[PDB]
Structures are given as C-alpha cells and as structure tokens.
PDB file of C-alpha atoms in Angstrom:
ATOM      1  CA  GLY A   1    -141.358 -11.208  29.761  1.00 14.65           C
ATOM      2  CA  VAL A   2    -140.278  -9.463  32.965  1.00 12.82           C
ATOM      3  CA  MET A   3    -139.032  -5.873  33.008  1.00 13.44           C
ATOM      4  CA  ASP A   4    -135.811  -4.868  34.759  1.00 13.06           C
ATOM      5  CA  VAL A   5    -132.965  -2.369  34.528  1.00 13.14           C
ATOM      6  CA  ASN A   6    -130.992  -4.737  32.283  1.00 12.94           C
ATOM      7  CA  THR A   7    -133.817  -4.410  29.734  1.00 10.09           C
ATOM      8  CA  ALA A   8    -134.798  -0.797  30.471  1.00 12.27           C
ATOM      9  CA  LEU A   9    -131.254   0.368  29.700  1.00 11.62           C
ATOM     10  CA  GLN A  10    -131.613  -0.804  26.094  1.00  9.67           C
ATOM     11  CA  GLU A  11    -134.835   1.157  25.589  1.00 10.59           C
ATOM     12  CA  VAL A  12    -133.563   4.308  27.306  1.00 10.78           C
ATOM     13  CA  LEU A  13    -130.250   4.329  25.416  1.00  9.82           C
ATOM     14  CA  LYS A  14    -132.107   3.748  22.142  1.00  8.78           C
ATOM     15  CA  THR A  15    -134.509   6.602  22.935  1.00 10.16           C
ATOM     16  CA  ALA A  16    -131.515   8.835  23.636  1.00 13.00           C
ATOM     17  CA  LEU A  17    -129.961   7.802  20.310  1.00 13.36           C
ATOM     18  CA  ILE A  18    -133.167   8.664  18.426  1.00 11.85           C
ATOM     19  CA  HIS A  19    -132.853  12.121  20.020  1.00 12.36           C
ATOM     20  CA  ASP A  20    -129.063  12.619  19.808  1.00 12.98           C
ATOM     21  CA  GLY A  21    -127.832  12.357  23.409  1.00 13.65           C
ATOM     22  CA  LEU A  22    -125.161   9.799  24.370  1.00 14.71           C
ATOM     23  CA  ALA A  23    -122.390  12.254  25.223  1.00 15.65           C
ATOM     24  CA  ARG A  24    -119.224  10.464  24.121  1.00 18.17           C
ATOM     25  CA  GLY A  25    -116.297  11.269  26.397  1.00 17.75           C
ATOM     26  CA  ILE A  26    -115.939  13.991  28.985  1.00 17.32           C
ATOM     27  CA  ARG A  27    -116.294  16.764  26.387  1.00 18.72           C
ATOM     28  CA  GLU A  28    -119.779  18.251  25.821  1.00 19.87           C
ATOM     29  CA  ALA A  29    -120.741  16.807  29.231  1.00 17.81           C
ATOM     30  CA  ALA A  30    -118.960  19.307  31.489  1.00 17.72           C
ATOM     31  CA  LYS A  31    -121.248  22.123  30.317  1.00 15.68           C
ATOM     32  CA  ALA A  32    -124.449  20.172  30.990  1.00 17.16           C
ATOM     33  CA  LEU A  33    -123.307  18.745  34.330  1.00 18.56           C
ATOM     34  CA  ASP A  34    -122.136  22.152  35.568  1.00 17.09           C
ATOM     35  CA  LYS A  35    -125.523  23.492  34.455  1.00 15.46           C
ATOM     36  CA  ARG A  36    -127.188  20.433  36.068  1.00 12.65           C
ATOM     37  CA  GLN A  37    -128.922  19.546  32.793  1.00  7.75           C
ATOM     38  CA  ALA A  38    -128.359  15.789  33.239  1.00  9.66           C
ATOM     39  CA  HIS A  39    -129.624  13.219  35.730  1.00  8.71           C
ATOM     40  CA  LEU A  40    -128.449   9.857  34.323  1.00 11.03           C
ATOM     41  CA  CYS A  41    -125.031   9.066  32.842  1.00 10.41           C
ATOM     42  CA  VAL A  42    -123.810   5.636  31.732  1.00 13.30           C
ATOM     43  CA  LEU A  43    -120.079   5.053  32.192  1.00 12.92           C
ATOM     44  CA  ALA A  44    -117.771   2.354  30.876  1.00 10.62           C
ATOM     45  CA  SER A  45    -117.424  -0.690  33.117  1.00  8.91           C
ATOM     46  CA  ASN A  46    -113.963  -2.098  33.849  1.00  8.61           C
ATOM     47  CA  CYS A  47    -112.453   1.225  32.811  1.00  6.44           C
ATOM     48  CA  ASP A  48    -108.658   1.007  32.916  1.00  6.10           C
ATOM     49  CA  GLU A  49    -108.065   4.653  33.915  1.00  4.08           C
ATOM     50  CA  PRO A  50    -108.103   5.120  37.719  1.00  2.00           C
ATOM     51  CA  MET A  51    -107.924   8.910  37.414  1.00  2.00           C
ATOM     52  CA  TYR A  52    -110.964   8.996  35.131  1.00  3.30           C
ATOM     53  CA  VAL A  53    -113.040   6.703  37.353  1.00  4.77           C
ATOM     54  CA  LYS A  54    -112.168   8.662  40.502  1.00  7.33           C
ATOM     55  CA  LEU A  55    -112.970  11.927  38.705  1.00  6.31           C
ATOM     56  CA  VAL A  56    -116.325  10.499  37.587  1.00  6.22           C
ATOM     57  CA  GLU A  57    -117.082   9.375  41.146  1.00  6.28           C
ATOM     58  CA  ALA A  58    -116.262  12.891  42.371  1.00  5.61           C
ATOM     59  CA  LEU A  59    -118.500  14.410  39.681  1.00  6.39           C
ATOM     60  CA  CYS A  60    -121.327  12.100  40.750  1.00  4.82           C
ATOM     61  CA  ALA A  61    -120.724  13.157  44.360  1.00  6.10           C
ATOM     62  CA  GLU A  62    -121.073  16.777  43.213  1.00  8.05           C
ATOM     63  CA  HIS A  63    -124.654  16.397  41.951  1.00  7.26           C
ATOM     64  CA  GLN A  64    -125.652  13.191  43.815  1.00  5.71           C
ATOM     65  CA  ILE A  65    -126.277  10.974  40.780  1.00  5.13           C
ATOM     66  CA  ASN A  66    -125.864   7.203  40.731  1.00  5.40           C
ATOM     67  CA  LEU A  67    -124.025   5.581  37.826  1.00  5.52           C
ATOM     68  CA  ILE A  68    -125.051   2.137  36.582  1.00  7.84           C
ATOM     69  CA  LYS A  69    -122.357  -0.566  36.503  1.00 11.02           C
ATOM     70  CA  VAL A  70    -123.244  -3.470  34.213  1.00  8.48           C
ATOM     71  CA  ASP A  71    -120.765  -6.074  32.981  1.00  6.45           C
ATOM     72  CA  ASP A  72    -120.724  -7.836  29.592  1.00  5.48           C
ATOM     73  CA  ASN A  73    -121.356  -4.747  27.465  1.00  3.53           C
ATOM     74  CA  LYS A  74    -121.080  -6.577  24.123  1.00  2.00           C
ATOM     75  CA  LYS A  75    -124.807  -7.356  24.130  1.00  2.03           C
ATOM     76  CA  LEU A  76    -125.538  -3.645  24.595  1.00  2.00           C
ATOM     77  CA  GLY A  77    -123.110  -2.781  21.799  1.00  2.00           C
ATOM     78  CA  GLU A  78    -124.853  -5.234  19.486  1.00  2.00           C
ATOM     79  CA  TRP A  79    -128.263  -3.874  20.516  1.00  2.00           C
ATOM     80  CA  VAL A  80    -127.403  -0.234  19.774  1.00  2.23           C
ATOM     81  CA  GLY A  81    -126.481  -1.085  16.164  1.00  3.11           C
ATOM     82  CA  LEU A  82    -122.987   0.229  16.694  1.00  2.00           C
ATOM     83  CA  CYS A  83    -120.925  -1.109  13.759  1.00  2.00           C
ATOM     84  CA  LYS A  84    -121.613   2.105  11.791  1.00  2.00           C
ATOM     85  CA  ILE A  85    -119.341   3.443   9.006  1.00  2.00           C
ATOM     86  CA  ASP A  86    -121.351   1.467   6.449  1.00  2.00           C
ATOM     87  CA  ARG A  87    -119.860  -1.913   7.402  1.00  2.00           C
ATOM     88  CA  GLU A  88    -116.179  -0.942   7.781  1.00  2.00           C
ATOM     89  CA  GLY A  89    -114.478  -1.141  11.161  1.00  2.00           C
ATOM     90  CA  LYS A  90    -116.173  -1.493  14.533  1.00  2.00           C
ATOM     91  CA  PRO A  91    -116.392   1.467  16.913  1.00  2.00           C
ATOM     92  CA  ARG A  92    -117.516   0.681  20.454  1.00  2.00           C
ATOM     93  CA  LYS A  93    -120.142   2.321  22.677  1.00  2.00           C
ATOM     94  CA  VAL A  94    -118.743   2.809  26.181  1.00  2.00           C
ATOM     95  CA  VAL A  95    -120.042   6.085  27.688  1.00  2.00           C
ATOM     96  CA  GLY A  96    -122.979   8.458  27.334  1.00  2.00           C
ATOM     97  CA  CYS A  97    -124.368  11.430  29.265  1.00  2.00           C
ATOM     98  CA  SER A  98    -128.025  12.132  28.476  1.00  2.00           C
ATOM     99  CA  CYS A  99    -129.154  15.755  28.264  1.00  2.00           C
ATOM    100  CA  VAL A 100    -132.440  17.456  29.266  1.00  2.00           C
ATOM    101  CA  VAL A 101    -133.650  15.497  32.336  1.00  2.00           C
ATOM    102  CA  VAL A 102    -134.100  11.710  32.439  1.00  2.00           C
ATOM    103  CA  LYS A 103    -136.412  11.379  29.431  1.00  2.00           C
ATOM    104  CA  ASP A 104    -136.006  13.194  26.119  1.00  2.00           C
ATOM    105  CA  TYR A 105    -138.872  14.898  24.282  1.00  2.00           C
ATOM    106  CA  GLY A 106    -139.783  11.683  22.452  1.00  2.00           C
ATOM    107  CA  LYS A 107    -141.501   8.520  23.617  1.00  2.00           C
ATOM    108  CA  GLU A 108    -142.236   7.641  27.246  1.00  2.00           C
ATOM    109  CA  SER A 109    -141.959   4.081  28.551  1.00  2.00           C
ATOM    110  CA  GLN A 110    -142.217   2.115  31.778  1.00  2.00           C
ATOM    111  CA  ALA A 111    -138.467   1.658  31.328  1.00  2.00           C
ATOM    112  CA  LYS A 112    -138.296   5.190  32.729  1.00  2.00           C
ATOM    113  CA  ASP A 113    -140.426   4.094  35.690  1.00  2.00           C
ATOM    114  CA  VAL A 114    -138.290   1.060  36.538  1.00  2.00           C
ATOM    115  CA  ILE A 115    -135.044   3.020  36.104  1.00  2.00           C
ATOM    116  CA  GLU A 116    -136.391   5.716  38.438  1.00  2.00           C
ATOM    117  CA  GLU A 117    -137.388   3.039  40.958  1.00  2.00           C
ATOM    118  CA  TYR A 118    -133.851   1.637  40.825  1.00  2.00           C
ATOM    119  CA  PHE A 119    -132.523   5.195  41.157  1.00  2.00           C
ATOM    120  CA  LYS A 120    -134.519   5.931  44.313  1.00  2.00           C
ATOM    121  CA  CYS A 121    -133.192   2.821  46.085  1.00  2.00           C
TER     122      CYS A 121
ATOM    123  CA  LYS B   1    -102.006  25.998 -22.360  1.00  2.00           C
ATOM    124  CA  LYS B   2     -99.690  23.908 -20.181  1.00  2.00           C
ATOM    125  CA  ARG B   3     -99.863  22.596 -16.648  1.00  2.00           C
ATOM    126  CA  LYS B   4     -99.884  25.499 -14.211  1.00  2.00           C
ATOM    127  CA  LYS B   5     -97.372  23.681 -11.963  1.00  2.00           C
ATOM    128  CA  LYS B   6     -98.059  25.230  -8.548  1.00  2.00           C
ATOM    129  CA  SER B   7     -95.024  23.481  -7.093  1.00  2.00           C
ATOM    130  CA  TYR B   8     -92.249  26.094  -6.784  1.00  2.00           C
ATOM    131  CA  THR B   9     -92.231  25.916  -2.969  1.00  2.00           C
ATOM    132  CA  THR B  10     -93.539  23.619  -0.214  1.00  2.00           C
ATOM    133  CA  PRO B  11     -93.141  20.158  -1.822  1.00  2.00           C
ATOM    134  CA  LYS B  12     -96.292  18.786  -0.167  1.00  2.00           C
ATOM    135  CA  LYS B  13     -98.276  20.780   2.385  1.00  2.00           C
ATOM    136  CA  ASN B  14    -100.994  18.865   4.221  1.00  2.00           C
ATOM    137  CA  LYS B  15    -103.909  19.612   6.534  1.00  2.00           C
ATOM    138  CA  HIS B  16    -103.379  20.948  10.042  1.00  2.00           C
ATOM    139  CA  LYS B  17    -102.432  18.328  12.637  1.00  2.00           C
ATOM    140  CA  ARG B  18    -104.348  18.300  15.935  1.00  2.00           C
ATOM    141  CA  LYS B  19    -103.565  15.813  18.715  1.00  2.00           C
ATOM    142  CA  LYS B  20    -106.041  15.404  21.571  1.00  2.00           C
ATOM    143  CA  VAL B  21    -105.980  13.589  24.898  1.00  2.00           C
ATOM    144  CA  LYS B  22    -107.920  10.325  25.040  1.00  2.00           C
ATOM    145  CA  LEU B  23    -109.664  11.655  28.166  1.00  2.00           C
ATOM    146  CA  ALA B  24    -108.686  15.176  29.209  1.00  2.00           C
ATOM    147  CA  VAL B  25    -107.008  15.328  32.623  1.00  2.00           C
ATOM    148  CA  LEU B  26    -105.572  18.863  32.290  1.00  2.00           C
ATOM    149  CA  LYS B  27    -109.080  20.330  32.743  1.00  2.00           C
ATOM    150  CA  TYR B  28    -109.822  19.124  36.293  1.00  2.00           C
ATOM    151  CA  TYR B  29    -107.319  18.030  38.919  1.00  2.00           C
ATOM    152  CA  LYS B  30    -106.846  17.031  42.553  1.00  2.00           C
ATOM    153  CA  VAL B  31    -104.806  18.807  45.265  1.00  2.00           C
ATOM    154  CA  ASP B  32    -107.165  21.537  46.446  1.00  2.00           C
ATOM    155  CA  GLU B  33    -108.363  20.061  49.789  1.00  2.00           C
ATOM    156  CA  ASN B  34    -111.553  19.104  47.927  1.00  2.00           C
ATOM    157  CA  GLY B  35    -113.168  15.731  47.310  1.00  2.00           C
ATOM    158  CA  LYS B  36    -114.933  17.099  44.224  1.00  2.00           C
ATOM    159  CA  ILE B  37    -113.462  18.174  40.902  1.00  2.00           C
ATOM    160  CA  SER B  38    -111.312  21.181  41.776  1.00  2.00           C
ATOM    161  CA  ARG B  39    -111.345  24.354  39.689  1.00  2.00           C
ATOM    162  CA  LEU B  40    -107.972  25.518  38.367  1.00  2.00           C
ATOM    163  CA  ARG B  41    -109.187  26.958  35.064  1.00  2.00           C
ATOM    164  CA  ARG B  42    -110.695  30.440  35.118  1.00  2.00           C
ATOM    165  CA  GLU B  43    -114.490  30.553  35.158  1.00  2.00           C
ATOM    166  CA  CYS B  44    -115.954  32.707  32.396  1.00  2.00           C
ATOM    167  CA  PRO B  45    -118.170  35.455  33.894  1.00  2.00           C
ATOM    168  CA  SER B  46    -120.015  35.966  30.597  1.00  2.00           C
ATOM    169  CA  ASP B  47    -123.499  34.479  30.361  1.00  2.00           C
ATOM    170  CA  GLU B  48    -123.036  33.374  26.732  1.00  2.00           C
ATOM    171  CA  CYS B  49    -120.199  31.079  27.883  1.00  2.00           C
ATOM    172  CA  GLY B  50    -119.992  28.816  30.908  1.00  2.00           C
ATOM    173  CA  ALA B  51    -118.128  26.421  33.191  1.00  2.00           C
ATOM    174  CA  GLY B  52    -117.875  23.818  30.425  1.00  2.00           C
ATOM    175  CA  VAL B  53    -116.061  26.381  28.296  1.00  2.00           C
ATOM    176  CA  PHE B  54    -112.330  26.125  29.033  1.00  2.00           C
ATOM    177  CA  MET B  55    -110.479  29.235  27.898  1.00  2.00           C
ATOM    178  CA  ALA B  56    -107.081  27.633  27.310  1.00  2.00           C
ATOM    179  CA  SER B  57    -104.732  28.986  29.992  1.00  2.00           C
ATOM    180  CA  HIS B  58    -101.601  29.067  27.857  1.00  2.00           C
ATOM    181  CA  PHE B  59     -98.468  31.109  28.556  1.00  2.00           C
ATOM    182  CA  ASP B  60    -100.356  34.231  27.430  1.00  2.00           C
ATOM    183  CA  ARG B  61    -103.909  35.569  27.019  1.00  2.00           C
ATOM    184  CA  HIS B  62    -107.275  33.803  27.284  1.00  2.00           C
ATOM    185  CA  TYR B  63    -108.631  32.112  24.153  1.00  2.00           C
ATOM    186  CA  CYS B  64    -112.412  31.633  24.163  1.00  2.00           C
ATOM    187  CA  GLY B  65    -113.909  31.351  20.668  1.00  2.00           C
ATOM    188  CA  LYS B  66    -116.898  33.686  21.072  1.00  2.00           C
ATOM    189  CA  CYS B  67    -115.770  36.713  23.113  1.00  2.00           C
ATOM    190  CA  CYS B  68    -112.017  36.113  23.567  1.00  2.00           C
ATOM    191  CA  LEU B  69    -111.301  38.142  26.692  1.00  2.00           C
ATOM    192  CA  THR B  70    -107.714  38.982  27.637  1.00  2.00           C
ATOM    193  CA  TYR B  71    -106.214  39.274  31.123  1.00  2.00           C
ATOM    194  CA  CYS B  72    -102.719  40.591  31.837  1.00  2.00           C
ATOM    195  CA  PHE B  73    -100.570  39.230  34.666  1.00  2.00           C
ATOM    196  CA  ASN B  74     -97.246  41.094  34.243  1.00  2.00           C
TER     197      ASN B  74
END
C-alpha cells in the first residue's frame, strides 16, 4: 500500500506498452536519442556485454539521463504479460527506450511523480 | 491439362537470408579521444533523414533508403 519506484516502473512500462514505446535493442533508439526525444530508458540488468554497457553509459553521459538498475527482472517479465506468440515459446523483456518525453499521451499517474522524484535525486 | 512443372532450373530457391548483429557495435566505436559515442559514420545533411539513419559505408557509394546520395572518393 506504499508507492515506490519498484511499483511505479510496472505502471510506467505498462503505459508505454499501451502506447507502443519500449524500444527493443539499440535500433530505433539512436534516432530519438540523437534528437533528444527520450528522457527515461530501461536497460537490462546483469548484461553480459561490457561493450554495450559502456556504450550505454556513454550515451547516458551524452544527454545526462539516469538509467534504473533493478535486479530480479522475472517479476517484471511476468507483469508485462510477455509470453506472447499465443502460448508458444517465451520471449523476454530486457530493454526499452520510451519516446516523446517521460509520459506518453495517455494516462497520467503519481508513478510519474515518484519516478521524477527519484530522477531528481 | 497437366502439371505446369516450373522446375527446369533452380531445384529449390528460398527467401533472402539476412543476418544481423545481436547488438550493433559497427555503428558506434571508441578510439576518438572522446568519452561519448564517437562518430565514424557520415552524418546525413538532409532534414528528412538524421543521425539515427546509418547510410551503410560499404566499399562503394552511400545507401540511404529515401534519398540515396552518392559520394566519390577516387
């Protein structure tokens, strides 16, 4: 019954999903980041590629954007309803860059407020 | 009529094969005295394209998809 980033992330990622967003991989994100159309990206935790993580840190240093590091992603993957493909297989949700500012054109929540408070500190 | 039998040549042609990097590293690189992502690919001056558009710098020409400009090096 207490709000936090660990619960605001679910709502914000879901809101992005309802309005596309969730830029999978580096592609389709370079355009927006070089146009400064994004202000919150979620990256995979415990990523096994040192070159990718150092490149992402450099990209964050370019536009001065924090990236949230949360362990135990399986709860998030279950929350986002990620099995897809009817019921065959199991793709995983590991990275997403959200377009058009922090909040999309849809619903507004205090999840935005708490995420912004965490962002400012 | 019989079967048309379109099998004189090419015993079984398939769709085009495209192989992609898991996470592209040929787009940005280090070694430019910069702590940020360093630009080796040519930046498109056209407004209708941008810095996220990577005209593939192959052995010849620039391949865009919308304007397809060409630069000669000689």
